[PDB]
Design a protein around this ligand. Structure first.
Ligand SMILES: [Ca+2]
Ligand SMILES: [Ca+2]
Ligand SMILES: [Ca+2]
Ligand SMILES: [Ca+2]
Ligand SMILES: [Ca+2]
Lengths: 338, 338, 338, 338, 338
């Protein structure tokens, strides 16, 4: 995630101008390889046309260039590109909106589950670590960065997310499907045992705890849904062929023809096709942001910091349910008292 | 469902290029028959024009070709195509979002419904199988793959979704409407009997169970709504006529005329209309993805794996409510304990 | 409602082609009268130009035709047409999504309200018929088909939706506003009396019943809102004038001029303006689907089957709350038992 | 609000044609003044060009007219107009969706709050009038029609919405912010007193009452948000300048030049610019509907009937909580009994 | 926030015309610096071309100007500009919709938490100030105006939002993440202590209080999400390069060439490029509103008045929970009594 919100707080003179001098998360970083390939191909074709070709073959190439430049507009690159990018951005913000945050649940665990002894501490930590374990189990499946941090469940044991007893229980409960749902059933059964044991005073608190847990379950299920059900491959293939064919055509039709021939539209012979390179910038950059936000759980600069979210959720939850349980600041009159 | 999310985790050099070499769920698989028909018709017309036609008829065909090529832009294929595809994609993701998952409900069943004896086991399995039976009853109606797996309710009896007593009860309760709603009333009555029998300790747990069941009912009702209320047939007919008329016009207007006549725009005579074939690719592929995602419960490569979802839901629910009821891993201090 | 979902389950060779041979809910049925009027006007103008007009008046008509054909693009028919149709489709699916279904409420009535005697039967049937009566009272106001089935509340008495006592009470409570909200207050008071009488064991069940009833109230209020607050008449007038002016211009500018005059763009003289008729097809069909989905509760082929929904809701609710109350299939071990 | 839903129930021959003969809520009523001003300016410029100008100044004006007509397409009126109108319509339906309806709350008040004596009557009427008073307090701030009906809170006292005791209490609680939130705190405290006094039997009913009241609070807060946070003035200025500059350019560039000069595109000299007037119709009407739906609480023909909503809510709520409390129709078997 | 809702209540003759004479929140205020820079560059280039350049260099500049003006349409400024502005506006209204309002929670605190003594007063004020402290802690992080008002937590102590005991507790609980979530855990623990101490009579009221608090937590988490996860920097860079390249091209291609050369399209030599300046107005103003609404928590004229919201929330909450607790107006019959 590249954050520049503080730099664009106010609309000032050239507020977006200072953002053009960035490299992390920039469009130049996503575009330089493709632009170098396109530049090399364009200038190789130019050197073939200007030097290698015989005059009749030069005339044939000029006719081909005019033919390709006159029909470049037949390719609806803007249409499919806009549809694809709109869908990608909608799915991207929906994928972020379904990232689970245990803050409501950890507040309810710190409040409802009573006991300042070691047993209540253990119970609260186990419940909120069940929540965090389910979250990290779904993030291990939907994110390549989290999977590279935790290649196996034993790495989750070494990271304090899973106890060896939980690892053995999860290996015992193995099925040919993903096992991210198991900590939710564990949470339900442990909360029922806590209520039956007197640690939870009323079943309405149990209902609130399980409602927050089920909201987290729905968010994790939506994450699994977005990881499994991708944008249809046909859309990706169509938009890729659109952009690639558009600029493969521009490799020939946007060549600067011989000004001695006095072709209409080719009177001035420049070396650098500034407008064609700007079109490459815009369209291929649109394609590259589609390629970057299609899976926002990878390891791109603008992809989500899911490892940081995992660590923050674990640390904050364990602080909230253990050190902050019935640990309140002294209740004193405020400044506006009477 | 064709999944390629892991292949596009990072925006790399030609990340979408490697996706062009796929066949399952590809646009070539959806386009090859139509493209072969279009190619055959185009080259038959070309061979008729170049060989069979008399010179005056060739002049008439050239005038007709210019007339058709000058007015190809009168057809708003992009407009109706974009509207139709946007509506199809919105409805497609809404249809996936309303696929029922019993995970919240099965967690509540494993927690609230008490009893490690055979009667509590039977009660929990019957409740969660009522949920799964309602889900499979609506998926039998909205999905052709599930209907091919279960042509009748007796096939659901052979698959363990329905007991013969439930089959007899459902045959007794027959009405001229769909009977997918019956297991929800069964769930409500059985949960009421469980609460009155002491298996459910508090009615707030009963309320939570029935709230999850009613959420599943709303999702299944939305599935039935999307199956019943299709996109209006007028839209499909209009977009089909748009694409078909566009490329039936291109069958004539995009023909390469005789370069000896020196027509404006037909100076260079190629054999393969690369731009016309690219337009066919893009537009007819847009139409084909509309045809593929219009009913995402069929048996296309990119259609939902509803049989897998049915099997996974049944297996996971029966594991969660029976083997995982009050079966917790040993509660031990974690790595960050004190 | 025209359903063709099963016919488009798989993307096959010409899947949308077989849908062009339909008549119910087709675009030809919505377009034939307007197309015949347009055809008659176009050919009357053609016969006036080719035969009735003097040569100088023919020259004036040719200049007028060129003037109208050169400025046909000044009319933004696609812009307003797309905005209007998108709004119509969004409102159409929102109107369907707010059609009340009493299934959750009838499950809660069959579960919570106890008593297998005649008094409990009467209570459950009265509650669920209050729900159905409110639904049919709002559908009588928002739908012309339901209003033609029930021109008065006495027709609702003859249809079993309302008892004569309820009809007298509703006549007594008459106000100059719509009285669809009355059965909700009746439901609340009757549920309170049921809870105070011991028929409902806990007030949490009362809360669940009234929550489902209030959800139905919100859906019916949204239906009343969509019936009352129409799309602003200015939008309809603007889009109608756009389409009508576009094709009134095409009545003159799309005429085939005399090829002897050798006008640019009018070299070939056909009889049938295929492209103009295709444009009429697409644009006027877009307008006609806007006209058909603007009020989806009428009696069009693609309009909702609201009478069927009313009958199904009444029948299913009365079956669920009366014959299915505490009437469960025998609870027996399933196939996967141990 | 102009309602024509019943007139467009069925898609008939010229269904939208009959809507062109309306005046209330019509586009002619919103467009006639601007169209008369544009017509007067256009014909004044025409009379200056044809009569007042010297021949050299006529040549200069012809060159200026060609220059303006060739660059009329540089103004993206359709782009900003579509964005602005889409945003306006979305905000308009969101503003209607957040209009508070007390029907759910009044049903809960008629049910939960017990007592057929004068004290229970007073309590129920006071609670539902607190709800209606909060609604009318926010509508007095967001609507100019409601503010013209009630210029002060004393007018609300004269209208029965506020008692003099409530007016004195609200004057005592005065702060430099809007005081529409006060009746919600009044409702909460009065409901707590009702529950503590035995009028509300269980606190779950208290929770339901306060949940409905808080939903009304959220709707009124959204109304206050839409009144306060307008569409940014920059958007309005940009779209207004776009339309005004487009048609100020059309005042010169769309003039009919002298046909004796034989200018290309100005061969035929008409008097009425039909296409320019149609463009004015469409674009300026789009602007006028943006001007009409930007604040849907004013006194336009298509603006909301907020005074009617206020009166209906007050009357219906006072009928529901007072005359309909425990006043049920006789519970008798229906037509389908056994 | 610039409010003009009352000025556009009715669609009158030139309703949007009076809004063009504004300066605060106007497009001229956002555009004058860029327009002056563009004007200076354009006229410097004009003076170089008309005076400094030799005749051959003037011919070269004329050819370059024609080349740039013929390919200005290759830049899709409207496409990326519309996508970016639509995304910005959607995110802007979503950011406003997640601004926390404690009105529902403060009503529940004033109702549920009993006690007119000093201890109940202290408890209610502490709970609602926990809510306001969490809100101001997230607004200090997402808003530069709130951060300039409160550069440190000691400034929050001086502003009455935080007691020194709370400041010490928050310093003790310091972690390398944002600490806005702490007052929610404080609220949960204090509400649990209030319920255990008898101040809250039933745990259902505790559930309602914590549900409102958790809704506020979700809103603040969404605010933190929008502050952290910005629009990807690639989009901003692409749209900025699009606008800047478009008008850097217009700096050369929109120059008025020598009319003596009689170039096609440059016959009339004006001094002021009115159409180019209008295009700058529209497109650069679209870019500037994107720059202004990208972070709506800064200090722009149209940015949110977050300091006012903070002050109003604090004042209104402290009035509602302290002075309005069990302080009701006298319950008397209204005007429509019997
Ligand atoms: Ca990525
Ligand atoms: Ca399919
Ligand atoms: Ca209709
Ligand atoms: Ca208005
Ligand atoms: Ca800002």
């Amino acid at each position: 995630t590249i954050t520049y919100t503080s730099q664009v707080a106010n609309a000032r003179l050239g507020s977006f101008s200072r953002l053009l001098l960035c490299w992390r998360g920039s469009i130049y970083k996503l575009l330089y390889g493709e632009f170098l390939i396109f530049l090399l191909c364009y200038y190789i074709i130019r050197f073939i046309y200007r030097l290698a070709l015989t005059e009749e073959q030069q005339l044939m190439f000029e006719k081909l260039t005019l033919y390709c430049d006159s029909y470049i507009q037949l390719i609806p690159i803007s249409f499919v590109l806009g549809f694809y990018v709109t869908l990608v951005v909608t799915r991207w913000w929906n994928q972020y909106e379904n990232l689970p945050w245990p803050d409501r649940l950890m507040s309810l665990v710190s409040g409802f589950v009573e006991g300042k002894d070691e047993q209540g501490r253990l119970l609260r930590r186990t419940l909120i670590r069940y929540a965090n374990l389910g979250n990290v189990l779904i993030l291990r499946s939907v994110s390549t960065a989290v999977y590279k941090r935790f290649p196996s469940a034993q790495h989750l044991v070494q990271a304090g997310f899973m106890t060896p007893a939980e690892h053995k229980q999860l290996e015992k409960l193995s099925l040919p499907h993903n096992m991210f749902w198991v900590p939710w059933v564990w949470f339900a059964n442990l909360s029922m045992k806590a209520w039956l044991g007197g640690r939870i005073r009323d079943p309405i608190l149990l209902q609130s705890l399980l409602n927050e847990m089920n909201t987290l379950r729905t968010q994790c299920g939506h994450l699994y849904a977005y990881d499994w059900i991708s944008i249809p491959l046909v859309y990706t293939q169509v938009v890729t062929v659109a952009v690639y064919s558009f600029f493969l055509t521009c490799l020939v039709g946007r060549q600067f023809l011989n000004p001695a021939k006095a072709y209409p539209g080719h009177e001035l012979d420049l070396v650098v096709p500034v407008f064609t390179f700007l079109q490459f910038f815009f369209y291929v950059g649109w394609l590259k942001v589609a390629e970057q936000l299609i899976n926002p759980f990878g390891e791109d600069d603008d992809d989500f910091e899911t490892n940081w979210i995992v660590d923050r959720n674990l640390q904050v939850s364990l602080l909230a349910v253990d050190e902050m349980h019935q640990d309140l600041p002294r209740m004193e009159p405020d400044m506006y008292w009477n």
